[PDB]
Symmetry: C2
Subunit: 303 residues, 2 copies
């Protein structure tokens, strides 16, 4: 029932231009659900004793120029406020707000209106919509099955209003292959695109239960984004200076560890604000005919 | 002064076949030094206010068939015991012992004789020898300069005897390009070797202060090890089953983010124990003429 407040000192293991910060956010999600749903998410099993994993399905990190994930450096002092929202017995929404520890109203509780309608430049807003899954066959990562560990307590969580729907957001992204409608005014699509062949990296993409790791989807998206950035003649130093003010990820599937994935990327540039762009990445498993992820990044850069 | 004991539940962010477990060990090292040396290692600065980093120099993870890093899965309950040993004002040795939370004498304190002479199959032994460094020029990762933040308290730490010398161990590895002497009896060198060109991966190899991340050296070593494993006709599934009972890493240098590194690997097989091998990896920066890392892995595998 109570929200979880933490004072966090930024460590090397949770920042930088890789996926470590997203990895820390997902561990916080599993801790918060464990505390609020009276379930050990780390060791969850169904009635037959089959492991069940609280898989990532929809993920958003929204910041701004005053605080974005690239702002975070060793030793920064943060305040983290975390809580869960009822999505039934098979799914759960976890929110995290991140503020600099010394900012004005850092002690404020979670506010759905602030997350969904009035986000503040200077705070980071994280949404993790997770779904319980089991393997349909040992050693297969395809055709995962919906689950719910016995004793999972969603009854004690606060409710979302109909307006605030992670499910509607991800349904539109699966259909459009973007989280920002192509008809959104104030953008122009560049003709330059990339399609990168990515064999699953069994040293870097794989978690401790033999699935593709949710954080490595962020890595694969940035590999596609960097391929497009280089295609447009832009520098590595300039890629490391990019400000990602918003990113959304939908995880449609996992993939077997011998899969060859395809990473497709396209970009729209602002016709209003120099340096503002929307990058869309689609991750395909061509051999099974599946789109396994979609991501949109809203960025601000300086050449 | 007191050792730090922690009860740890294995999270997705600290296990699997990547470098996440090594990343968690290094964050624990920075926490333990901070607590025992009255210094905020995460935000350390010298007298002019230049950032100073407690860089990794020598790293060992020693396990065995009963507990090795590949043993760890989501939700496992561990006991971690951590403490620092005096290496003067510019360096510090941190030890971590990891036991399963329910094992017989998991509450025992750190024991140098147990770490250096009588390690137990069923416990994991970690040594981190770290050295304070500053950049010699902003944005340069070469020719780092020895440092010590003002107020660094090594005076309060226990001493190593002369017999137990991380410095002697790493000096021999820099010279031999292995931590296991080539004249060690009971091994035969295979003729198969690999040399892999690895551009620095600015999405995956780089930390939050723009240096090569200590954990990504472990990733680069496993990329070389996998290249050699495939050269010998062995399967990906078999690589994911490898038992690494001992690994040692020396970090001789860092590298600029536009560097192209070379990863060289060789292997010795046991003439006594089927499936037992010693793999040596050397990481070179050809353009600057530097060996920047050496690693040796002691492994047990099943084809
Ligand atoms: C352990 C790892 C993890 O945590 O997450 C890994 C990354 N994420 C994923 O692997 C999740 C990928 N998503 C999925 O596998 C599937 O989307 C789920 C299985 C969660 C659900 O399966 P699926 O969509 O195939 O049918 P649904 O149950 O969702 O059915 C919805 C409708 O479509 C069809 C069916 O008939 C149904 O219609 P109705 O609503 O009318 O019944 S990790 O992160 O540490 O790596
Ligand atoms: C922040 C990052 C980190 O924590 O670690 C990153 C990975 N590790 C490293 O980058 C460390 C790499 N090592 C080094 O840069 C150098 O080995 C150090 C700088 C630490 C020391 O420099 P160097 O060896 O060039 O001269 P020494 O001071 O060590 O001098 C030893 C002898 O050789 C010569 C000199 O004259 C001296 O002789 P004397 O003893 O007679 O004086 S991260 O891990 O988050 O990524």
């Amino acid at each position: 029932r109570p929200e979880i407040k933490q004072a966090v000192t930024v460590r090397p293991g949770m920042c930088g231009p890789g996926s470590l910060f997203v990895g820390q956010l997902g561990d916080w999600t599993w801790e918060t659900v464990s505390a609020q749903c009276d379930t050990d998410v780390f060791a969850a099993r169904d009635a037959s004793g089959n492991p069940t994993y609280l898989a990532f399905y929809y993920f958003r990190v929204r910041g701004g120029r005053e605080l974005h994930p690239g702002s975070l450096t060793f030793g920064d002092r943060l305040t983290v406020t975390s809580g869960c929202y009822d999505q039934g017995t098979e799914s759960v929404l976890t929110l995290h707000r991140i503020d600099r520890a010394g900012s004005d109203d850092a002690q404020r509780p979670l506010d759905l209106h602030e997350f969904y309608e009035r986000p503040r430049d200077g705070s980071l807003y994280v949404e993790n919509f997770n779904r319980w899954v089991t393997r349909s066959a040992p050693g297969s990562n395809e055709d995962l099955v919906k689950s719910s560990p016995p004793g999972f307590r969603n009854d004690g969580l606060p409710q979302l209003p109909a307006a605030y729907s992670p499910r509607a957001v991800y349904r539109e992204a699966r259909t459009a292959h973007t989280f920002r409608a192509l008809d959104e005014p104030g953008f122009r699509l560049l003709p330059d695109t990339v399609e990168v062949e990515h064999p699953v990296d069994i040293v870097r993409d794989v978690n401790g239960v033999g699935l593709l790791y949710f954080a490595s989807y962020f890595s694969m998206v940035d590999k596609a984004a960097l391929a497009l950035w280089r295609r447009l003649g832009r520098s590595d130093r300039a890629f490391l200076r990019r400000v990602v003010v918003d990113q959304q990820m939908c995880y449609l599937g996992n993939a077997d560890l011998d899969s060859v994935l395809t990473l497709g990327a396209r970009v729209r540039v602002s016709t209003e604000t120099p340096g503002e762009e929307l990058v869309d990445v689609v991750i395909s498993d061509r051999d099974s005919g599946r789109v396994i992820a979609v991501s949109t990044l809203h960025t601000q850069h300086d050449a």
